[PDB]
Design a protein around this ligand. Structure first.
Ligand SMILES: [Ca+2]
Ligand SMILES: [Ca+2]
Ligand SMILES: [Ca+2]
Ligand SMILES: [Ca+2]
Ligand SMILES: [Cl-]
Ligand SMILES: [Cl-]
Ligand SMILES: [Cl-]
Ligand SMILES: [Cl-]
Ligand SMILES: [Cl-]
Ligand SMILES: [Cl-]
Lengths: 248, 250, 252, 248
């Protein structure tokens, strides 16, 4: 399960894999403190996504993160369906699909995040992150702790805070980290995270006393030519995680 | 059978409770079938016993069963979600955060699921924090009505159950809910404190706003406490008000 | 001889305003606050002026008449009811909508009380919305006016403070500071209301005292009410009093 | 004995001052009853003396007395007089309207609300009490927002003062249009004389203000006796009939 993937129980990386070969190199470079993203959108049917994800899982101790694909809400229903057949270790989901996904897991255990977004209003998140809700003229903009309580009632384990646009919403992010710490809830900062702002983003969460943090680092560490997530980048991220977690 | 068969001229269906299966049959007759009959999960100690009972009701009333929490009791949300794996009924009462689980659990079966959202004292806004953990929070998620509608659609729900209304204590709020539902093409289920003296007003507000589909819930106000039965004459009276109003506005 | 409400301000600067579930809760609150509180009793909770008057007198008998007469639920239809209650019972403090202040002061007659005036944030620093009566609040446009012009009108109508609502906690912080500074310059009192909780209370009181407002009445309602018992939490009142003392003890 | 009897064809009532009871009787006759006669609170040292006087005037002219300020320092005096004598018509400053209404109790009367030209078409100055008029800035508000406030305070009309004759004509016409649209009465005052009276009343009538009370003070008063000139009242009534007969 996912609890094995947190360095000292505090931080697990989430990065994408180009293919199974890349997944294996990533898992090794992270010393196992990682869940590896496999994207539902890369496969034409639920059936094919399941078979692929089981194949990844076999090589990396089922440390698979089931992905939408950069938070793409068109894939929410697909991910909910996949959960009937494959739990992975970690599941990315939009806010309104968390309940369906948890129900679909049935007797299987997994960890499900809930995508909520910056609003420009410190203290408040946008929970309207499914297909119909994201197409609304207005969004449901709610205090962070009220979103956490709803995610709990729906069977989720964390907030996926996306799109962060790196540090563009840093003040808002600090408030989300504080609320998560106060409620004993996990946090997954995502969007525009790179080797340069990674330390800051993870430190903010640990300094706030968020117990479990899963930073997501996607295209910024992907080699454009080969498409592979770079093993040296994964090393560098892990080095940061250790430096920070050892102190906090 | 699809709940759509239960709406008079496609516009209004009653939701009332039944005390036993005979009472349910009498109600279904009195309403000319334009009703779903509430059977409460909280009246059964196991999901299995609730399922067995609900199927027995459904056999006698063309499956026009409304699966109840029990006065919106949020502790029954998980029970109702589990019942949906085994019995879809025609109509399911659920709290906002449990709609998605309930829809998923229906599996290959179809049914109609409402979503409990509450008055806030703030015209234009509803409280969606109606599950066990969310309702215990110090603050609630108070959102514009249409944003709640959109979320309910993404979770697989069919309507807003607007509760507790306290009759017309929140009339201005309720008017705004009806306007939003009409604009969004979404159904509305007014509930709480509805009786023979405010039923017409409450249904009229929704129809005048051009809400397409309305399901008013009328519970204890029409129950004879001596027998425990929902009063058949009350159901006939409510049906007559429905036909008058639907004929006027449809 | 001191006015009743002057007795309710800690060192003359801050009086709490909280609701009570019943008389015993009111008594408990008044003790927890060391009397530096007025307790809200809402007119909307009574179906006649006479019943409200009886009830409010009964609260007053137990808490040195430290009753704050309320509208209830923000329902501006209660403004006329509050104005009529004032003919019979002054309490210590009266909540009123801007256009109903004058009738309320007139109806007090020979009786003494402190009357606030509801004005609202506008999204425009320096300006408040005074269109808070039944007809005016339903208008196509609102009377949006500089803060001091609202203060001077409230004074001509017989009121004592601005009730600044709805604050949404610290959402209108910049607008609120401008209201506080204008109140300070005019020697007028301020009653911040809406979304105040144990976490933002200190900042809300500090913004006002730092700007040199002399008398502040923060209203703390749902955030300190136990939803299960309906009581305003006595331990929350004790905590808020401790904050008030810590601030006020260094603000002169 | 209410003010509705004082409007010629239900449209226009004069308001002019009386210097003594004989002058009041003469004015009431000259206007054929289509007048409220002003008695100034400031002409008496106490409320009680004003009340005794105003009652004596009213006895002679069918209660057709307009209670006058004469001056915002008299606002509180007028509010107090209203406890004891309603007249038919009461002049009041904007912030004292609700006190005055409340003081009337069960007695009926018509209360105006003094609001002022601003130099900004569409906007009136409602800061017309003693403290408000002494402010550095004034509350300058859209006309219809003033009307709604006056209604919430229990007033019946806007007293638009000081007009300075036609110096604020564009503004006045906009006030008339707004009053007509809202079904509210209007009382033009300040510098009205025999030369601009027709123009001022025509503006209100073409705007379709239902009830208009033009106030004509010093321009028709004999300085040597203090009396309002009875022939001037007849001249004004002739203009009122000539105009109003075209609209009613
Ligand atoms: Ca099958
Ligand atoms: Ca038709
Ligand atoms: Ca000072
Ligand atoms: Ca000092
Ligand atoms: Cl981003
Ligand atoms: Cl229910
Ligand atoms: Cl109810
Ligand atoms: Cl100052
Ligand atoms: Cl608020
Ligand atoms: Cl003039």
């Amino acid at each position: 399960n996912i609890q094995k993937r947190f360095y000292k129980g505090r931080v697990a990386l989430n990065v994408l894999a180009n293919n199974i070969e890349n997944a294996k190199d990533i898992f090794e470079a992270a010393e196992g403190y990682v869940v590896v993203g496999v994207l539902s959108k890369d496969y034409p049917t639920v059936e094919e996504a399941v078979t692929a994800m089981k194949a990844y899982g076999k090589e990396i101790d089922d440390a698979v993160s089931i992905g939408l694909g950069a938070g793409d809400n068109r894939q929410a229903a697909v991910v909910a369906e996949i959960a009937k057949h494959y739990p992975g270790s970690h599941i990315n989901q939009v806010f309104p699909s968390v309940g369906a996904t948890r129900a679909n897991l049935g007797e299987k255990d997994s960890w499900i995040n809930s995508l909520v977004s910056p609003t420009g209003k410190v203290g408040y998140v946008n929970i309207s992150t499914g297909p119909i809700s994201a197409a609304g003229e207005e969004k449901a903009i709610v205090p962070i702790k009220t979103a956490i309580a709803l995610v709990r009632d729906m069977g989720g384990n964390s907030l996926k805070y996306f799109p962060m646009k790196g540090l563009a919403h840093e003040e808002e992010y600090r408030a989300v980290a504080k609320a998560c710490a106060e409620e004993g809830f996990a946090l997954e900062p995502t969007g525009g995270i790179d080797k340069e702002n990674f330390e800051t983003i993870v430190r903010i969460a640990l300094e706030a006393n968020v117990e479990q943090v899963i930073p997501h680092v996607y295209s910024s560490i992907i080699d454009k030519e080969t498409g592979n997530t770079k093993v040296e980048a994964v090393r560098e991220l892990l080095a940061v995680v250790k430096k920070l977690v050892d102190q906090y």
